[PDB]
Design a protein around this motif. Sequence first.
Motif, PDB file in Angstrom:
ATOM      1  N   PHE A  46       0.880  -1.166   0.000  1.00 49.97           N
ATOM      2  CA  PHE A  46       0.000   0.000   0.000  1.00 49.97           C
ATOM      3  C   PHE A  46       0.914   1.211   0.000  1.00 49.97           C
ATOM      4  CE2 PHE A  46      -4.025  -2.047   0.749  1.00 49.97           C
ATOM      5  CZ  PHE A  46      -3.645  -3.244   1.300  1.00 49.97           C
ATOM      6  N   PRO A  47       1.180   1.803  -1.161  1.00 48.13           N
ATOM      7  CA  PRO A  47       2.295   2.751  -1.280  1.00 48.13           C
ATOM      8  C   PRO A  47       2.136   4.042  -0.497  1.00 48.13           C
ATOM      9  CG  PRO A  47       1.498   1.984  -3.420  1.00 48.13           C
ATOM     10  CD  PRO A  47       0.459   1.651  -2.428  1.00 48.13           C
ATOM     11  N   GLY A  48       1.091   4.804  -0.780  1.00 45.86           N
ATOM     12  CA  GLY A  48       0.992   6.117  -0.181  1.00 45.86           C
ATOM     13  C   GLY A  48       0.240   6.187   1.118  1.00 45.86           C
ATOM     14  N   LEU A  91       8.175   6.133   3.426  1.00 51.11           N
ATOM     15  CA  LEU A  91       8.737   6.474   4.720  1.00 51.11           C
ATOM     16  C   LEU A  91       8.628   7.975   4.921  1.00 51.11           C
ATOM     17  CD1 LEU A  91      12.618   6.252   4.790  1.00 51.11           C
ATOM     18  CD2 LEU A  91      11.399   6.300   2.674  1.00 51.11           C
ATOM     19  N   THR A  92       8.589   8.381   6.187  1.00 54.50           N
ATOM     20  CA  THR A  92       8.359   9.772   6.535  1.00 54.50           C
ATOM     21  C   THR A  92       9.580  10.618   6.209  1.00 54.50           C
ATOM     22  OG1 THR A  92       9.096   9.365   8.791  1.00 54.50           O
ATOM     23  CG2 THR A  92       6.784   9.208   8.371  1.00 54.50           C
ATOM     24  N   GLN A  93       9.429  11.919   6.398  1.00 57.34           N
ATOM     25  CA  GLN A  93      10.501  12.855   6.117  1.00 57.34           C
ATOM     26  C   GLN A  93      11.520  12.905   7.253  1.00 57.34           C
ATOM     27  OE1 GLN A  93       8.786  16.548   4.948  1.00 57.34           O
ATOM     28  NE2 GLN A  93      10.636  17.344   3.964  1.00 57.34           N
ATOM     29  N   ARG A 130       6.885  -9.687  -7.574  1.00 58.94           N
ATOM     30  CA  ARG A 130       5.744 -10.327  -6.934  1.00 58.94           C
ATOM     31  C   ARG A 130       4.840  -9.300  -6.272  1.00 58.94           C
ATOM     32  NH1 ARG A 130       8.487 -15.099  -6.058  1.00 58.94           N
ATOM     33  NH2 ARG A 130       7.603 -16.780  -7.336  1.00 58.94           N
ATOM     34  N   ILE A 131       5.423  -8.245  -5.703  1.00 57.52           N
ATOM     35  CA  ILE A 131       4.627  -7.183  -5.098  1.00 57.52           C
ATOM     36  C   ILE A 131       3.929  -6.366  -6.179  1.00 57.52           C
ATOM     37  CG2 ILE A 131       4.809  -5.142  -3.622  1.00 57.52           C
ATOM     38  CD1 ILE A 131       6.815  -6.488  -1.978  1.00 57.52           C
ATOM     39  N   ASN A 132       4.511  -6.288  -7.370  1.00 55.11           N
ATOM     40  CA  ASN A 132       3.819  -5.705  -8.511  1.00 55.11           C
ATOM     41  C   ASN A 132       2.823  -6.653  -9.164  1.00 55.11           C
ATOM     42  OD1 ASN A 132       6.727  -3.842  -9.248  1.00 55.11           O
ATOM     43  ND2 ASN A 132       4.727  -3.010  -8.694  1.00 55.11           N
ATOM     44  N   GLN A 133       2.447  -7.743  -8.506  1.00 53.38           N
ATOM     45  CA  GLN A 133       1.341  -8.571  -8.945  1.00 53.38           C
ATOM     46  C   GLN A 133       0.312  -8.774  -7.847  1.00 53.38           C
ATOM     47  OE1 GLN A 133       2.852 -12.104 -10.786  1.00 53.38           O
ATOM     48  NE2 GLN A 133       1.236 -12.190 -12.333  1.00 53.38           N
ATOM     49  N   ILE A 134       0.507  -8.168  -6.680  1.00 54.28           N
ATOM     50  CA  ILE A 134      -0.488  -8.192  -5.619  1.00 54.28           C
ATOM     51  C   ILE A 134      -1.173  -6.837  -5.592  1.00 54.28           C
ATOM     52  CG2 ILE A 134      -0.905  -8.729  -3.204  1.00 54.28           C
ATOM     53  CD1 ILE A 134       1.726 -10.118  -3.090  1.00 54.28           C
ATOM     54  N   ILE A 135      -0.430  -5.783  -5.929  1.00 50.82           N
ATOM     55  CA  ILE A 135      -0.957  -4.430  -5.791  1.00 50.82           C
ATOM     56  C   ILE A 135      -1.982  -4.136  -6.877  1.00 50.82           C
ATOM     57  CG2 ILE A 135      -0.370  -2.004  -5.906  1.00 50.82           C
ATOM     58  CD1 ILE A 135       2.172  -2.569  -4.488  1.00 50.82           C
ATOM     59  N   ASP A 186      -7.206   8.149  -7.801  1.00 51.40           N
ATOM     60  CA  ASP A 186      -5.980   8.735  -8.331  1.00 51.40           C
ATOM     61  C   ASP A 186      -5.810  10.194  -7.941  1.00 51.40           C
ATOM     62  OD1 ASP A 186      -6.255   6.309  -9.407  1.00 51.40           O
ATOM     63  OD2 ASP A 186      -6.162   6.930 -11.509  1.00 51.40           O
ATOM     64  N   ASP A 187      -6.903  10.947  -7.827  1.00 54.56           N
ATOM     65  CA  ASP A 187      -6.763  12.349  -7.462  1.00 54.56           C
ATOM     66  C   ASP A 187      -6.449  12.547  -5.988  1.00 54.56           C
ATOM     67  OD1 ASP A 187      -9.450  12.015  -6.305  1.00 54.56           O
ATOM     68  OD2 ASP A 187     -10.175  12.280  -8.352  1.00 54.56           O
ATOM     69  N   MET A 188      -6.577  11.510  -5.164  1.00 55.51           N
ATOM     70  CA  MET A 188      -6.062  11.558  -3.803  1.00 55.51           C
ATOM     71  C   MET A 188      -4.660  10.986  -3.717  1.00 55.51           C
ATOM     72  SD  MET A 188      -9.172  10.679  -1.208  1.00 55.51           S
ATOM     73  CE  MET A 188     -10.521  11.826  -0.980  1.00 55.51           C
ATOM     74  N   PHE A 189      -4.374   9.955  -4.513  1.00 56.49           N
ATOM     75  CA  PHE A 189      -3.069   9.301  -4.463  1.00 56.49           C
ATOM     76  C   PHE A 189      -1.977  10.202  -5.016  1.00 56.49           C
ATOM     77  CE2 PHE A 189       0.135   6.691  -6.609  1.00 56.49           C
ATOM     78  CZ  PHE A 189       0.610   5.972  -5.545  1.00 56.49           C
ATOM     79  N   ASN A 190      -2.284  10.970  -6.061  1.00 60.17           N
ATOM     80  CA  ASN A 190      -1.289  11.869  -6.630  1.00 60.17           C
ATOM     81  C   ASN A 190      -1.039  13.082  -5.751  1.00 60.17           C
ATOM     82  OD1 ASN A 190      -0.507  10.612  -9.151  1.00 60.17           O
ATOM     83  ND2 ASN A 190      -2.606  10.995  -9.832  1.00 60.17           N
ATOM     84  N   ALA A 191      -1.947  13.391  -4.828  1.00 61.40           N
ATOM     85  CA  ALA A 191      -1.789  14.527  -3.937  1.00 61.40           C
ATOM     86  C   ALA A 191      -1.364  14.119  -2.535  1.00 61.40           C
ATOM     87  CB  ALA A 191      -3.084  15.334  -3.875  1.00 61.40           C
ATOM     88  N   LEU A 192      -0.740  12.951  -2.378  1.00 56.79           N
ATOM     89  CA  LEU A 192      -0.241  12.563  -1.064  1.00 56.79           C
ATOM     90  C   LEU A 192       1.189  13.018  -0.831  1.00 56.79           C
ATOM     91  CD1 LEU A 192      -1.580   8.978  -0.345  1.00 56.79           C
ATOM     92  CD2 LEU A 192      -2.396  11.161   0.518  1.00 56.79           C
ATOM     93  N   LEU A 193       2.041  12.937  -1.851  1.00 57.08           N
ATOM     94  CA  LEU A 193       3.419  13.395  -1.676  1.00 57.08           C
ATOM     95  C   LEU A 193       3.558  14.917  -1.652  1.00 57.08           C
ATOM     96  CD1 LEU A 193       6.485  12.834  -1.506  1.00 57.08           C
ATOM     97  CD2 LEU A 193       6.475  12.943  -3.988  1.00 57.08           C
ATOM     98  N   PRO A 194       2.983  15.709  -2.579  1.00 55.36           N
ATOM     99  CA  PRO A 194       3.160  17.165  -2.459  1.00 55.36           C
ATOM    100  C   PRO A 194       2.392  17.796  -1.315  1.00 55.36           C
ATOM    101  CG  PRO A 194       2.692  16.553  -4.706  1.00 55.36           C
ATOM    102  CD  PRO A 194       2.278  15.426  -3.846  1.00 55.36           C
TER     103      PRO A 194
END
Lengths: 45, 300, 50, 50, 50, 100, 100
Positions: free
Chosen positions: B48-50, B89-91, B228-233, B245-253
Amino acid sequence: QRPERIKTTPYLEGDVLSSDSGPLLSVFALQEIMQKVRQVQADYM
Amino acid sequence: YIAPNPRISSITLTQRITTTGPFAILTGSTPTAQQLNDVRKIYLALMFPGQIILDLKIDPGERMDPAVRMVAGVVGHLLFTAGGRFTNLTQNMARQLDIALNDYLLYMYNTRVQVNYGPTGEPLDFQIGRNQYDCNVFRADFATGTGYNGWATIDVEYREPAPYVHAQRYIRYCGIDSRELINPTTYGIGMTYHCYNEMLRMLVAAGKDSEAAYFRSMLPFHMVRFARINQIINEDLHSVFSLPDDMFNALLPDLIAGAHQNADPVVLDVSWISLWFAFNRSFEPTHRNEMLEVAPLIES
Amino acid sequence: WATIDVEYREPAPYVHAQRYIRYCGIDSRELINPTTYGIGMTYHCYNEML
Amino acid sequence: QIILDLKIDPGERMDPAVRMVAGVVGHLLFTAGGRFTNLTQNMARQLDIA
Amino acid sequence: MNLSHSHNFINIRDMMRWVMLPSLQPSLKLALEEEAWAAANDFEDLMLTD
Amino acid sequence: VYASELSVMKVDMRHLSLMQRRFPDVLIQARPSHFWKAVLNDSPEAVKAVMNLSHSHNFINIRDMMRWVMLPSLQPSLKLALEEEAWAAANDFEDLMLTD
Amino acid sequence: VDVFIGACSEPVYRIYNRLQGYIEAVQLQELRNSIGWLERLGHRKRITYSQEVLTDFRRQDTIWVLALQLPVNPQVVWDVPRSSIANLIMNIATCLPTGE
């Protein structure tokens, strides 16, 4: 039953260490969020 | 979970004359009942990336070898991702791995190769080696992901439209398609990505010609795991309950600016030795979920 | 003797004492392994004693 | 095909009597350069400081 | 062969390079195996047809 | 903690050294060493005990604390920013309910 | 916040209007400075500091209160008159190692 899981070399064949299922990590992720908020509310005013 | 093949770090030649691995102490070790739950906090953050990110969990009640932390700064810079699209990981933990890497590249038990410091006092601000590799690139810069995975790697790409219209992205950890395990691109030798390939030719240049010769042999076990993790996600963890996607792309900035968000990343925290135990596991799946068939009836 | 002893660096955490004392010319920012440190090092006062 | 490299055992590397004996001996026994080698790049550096 | 790629990796792109390389070693087994395949070219000779 | 308790000790001694000039009829016989005793009797014992490692074998007098008190150097915390505000609210001694 | 209009005495409200002026200054630029200085400190003295309390899942709606500030102005410790011995003894007892 999948062509990916065929192992033709003895390189991706190791031991089995531990297992994890679907509904085990869902109770585990909830038990590690509330435990992190019950800890820091008992150490500070 | 699948430990790697035990013949990777040891070759026997004639009767009992064996090649010894450099991390022979950390390989032959047992995870306790607490450091095994932290491994399940790392693999929960990779699938679960972001939405789940990690921290350090400093406690005074335990004590480990001082060398456990320094190897946990080499494994950490090629396992997580702080690229230009999301983060694992956090900052703060991105800063704490940098001082862990800086302490590993200056603690030289063999003959001291030369080093030229820079003007500032930031970690990894030097030029180690005879060929003088610039180690400034391994500082965590969250705008471009200069140190971790996703350095020069497109890691989120889009394809033909998904059945769920809100989540149409495809996660590619380290630029490995899931079809690479079936129909491969390169030979057995030239499997690489950019972040791993710079952690080899710098660690060779830092005088550790035996440590980077161990990470080279563990490279195809590494890239198969992220395949393998790129076949579960993007093939099993695809539901209504995933992040649009409009929430996932706005998690890092939003993490850099610190603004208010209604999709706050859950912060967990892992130990120092759990970085090493997460490197030597694979998590191949065995059966799919018991209610993956009746999942769209529940969601409706 | 013919060696810098005090050196000044980037701003310290405490702004009043930002000097950086280096005895006998040892720029000690590294983690010293005791067996392979100073295996080819010297300074001016020790060389003119030998 | 098989080169060799020194151990990282402390004390013995700090032992000066065995260190100079195994520097003179290693220059008459091995081969490093020319057409092939029996020492690593790191080992032949330590057999010259010795 | 599993002495070498028990800790080296070879995938499907490595076996097709090794197979298509021109190098054989004739014996009594290979000289009949090459002719066993040339007889089983037409699949009516194996008694199976669509 | 130590640098924020010397600051409350200085602000208490700043606004107290004006009490003789503002009320001469009460402090006819109040030397400046009298309010030095009255601030040490309310400051913490440990902070005084840190200072008593230097001037246990060094001599400082009443002319050597007014140089320390008048020097501008403070460390703001929650107890300094409220002590300095409390003296400014108790400026008129009509507000402390005593009048001649 | 929920602001409203109530009643209070004159030199009691002067403290309350200064206390809340300090909690407003903790949120903006003092929690980000005390944490941001310890990271510059443990980078030098090799002391890994933990930020475990700013990072639970209720961190969005949480008012932080810090009664102390970390970037200590070191002139207020060195303004104590003839305090060069207590600054040597307190430096030994706090930071000196112990070994064979």
